[PDB]
Amino acid sequence: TVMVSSDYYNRSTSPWNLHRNEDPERYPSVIWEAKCRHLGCINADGNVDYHMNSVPIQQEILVLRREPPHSPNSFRLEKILVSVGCTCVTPIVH
Amino acid sequence: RTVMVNLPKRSSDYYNRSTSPWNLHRNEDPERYPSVIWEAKCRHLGCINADGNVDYHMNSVPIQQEILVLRFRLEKILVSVGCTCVTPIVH
Ligand SMILES: c1ccc(CNc2cncc(-c3ccc4[nH]nc(NCCN5CCOCC5)c4c3)c2)cc1
Numbered sequence A: 001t002v003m004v005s006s007d008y009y010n011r012s013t014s015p016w017n018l019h020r021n022e023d024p025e026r027y028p029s030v031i032w033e034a035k036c037r038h039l040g041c042i043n044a045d046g047n048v049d050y051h052m053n054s055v056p057i058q059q060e061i062l063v064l065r066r067e068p069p070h071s072p073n074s075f076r077l078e079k080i081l082v083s084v085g086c087t088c089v090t091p092i093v094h
Numbered sequence B: 001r002t003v004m005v006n007l008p009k010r011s012s013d014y015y016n017r018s019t020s021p022w023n024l025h026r027n028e029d030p031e032r033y034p035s036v037i038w039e040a041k042c043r044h045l046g047c048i049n050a051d052g053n054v055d056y057h058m059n060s061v062p063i064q065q066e067i068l069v070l071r072f073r074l075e076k077i078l079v080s081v082g083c084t085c086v087t088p089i090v091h
């Protein structure tokens, strides 16, 4: 108890889409959440190479959820997993 | 406004298996929440081709994420989470 622009998503070889994550009893209110565009990965010709995997990369973030519910003064410190982007990986059996 | 508050990168393998692999640097701080923050650092500037060699005509770039940090004062820092492989703006 304590009192208190980027263009990679569309250029990647593992491009991703971006989603909003709304919750009014939470600070920050909206979080951009990435979603891998492809299963495989874009090759030199710009087609999908299914020999490779687009995989979402995640980050643990702290978030303040209002408690009691819908309270502008009291919050609970939470941890949620948020996909921030996609990388291209070799499958474990390549 | 003053307010009242109640109080994967250790198990993932994409970092060593990516075409834009990355390094991890651990930041321990006792006077912070989170105490521990792993910051990703692109291994190469180029990307890895089929033969495990670096293609310097593609770019490893770090993906950033704004996260909340408590010191109490609530702060926002940018943390590199991993690296993706991008076509340079002129390819
Ligand atoms: C290391 C790492 C990766 C590789 C191979 N991987 C790769 C290499 N070099 C460029 C791209 C690459 C990446 C992203 C793209 N997006 N669009 C691209 N090309 C336009 C396609 N369009 C389709 C629709 O018709 C209009 C044209 C396009 C190309 C991908 C080699 C070595």
Ligand SMILES: c1ccc(CNc2cncc(-c3ccc4[nH]nc(NCCN5CCOCC5)c4c3)c2)cc1
Residues within 6 Å of the ligand: A013, A041, A042, A043, A044, A049, A052, A088, A090, B017, B018, B019, B048, B049, B050, B051, B052, B053
């Ligand atoms: C879409 C996106 C990207 C591409 C090209 N990008 C790529 C494709 N497929 C595998 C790797 C990749 C990634 C990481 C690795 N680490 N080691 C690798 N290969 C070791 C090879 N051996 C060296 C010693 O001689 C025997 C052979 C190795 C390969 C990289 C194509 C299409």
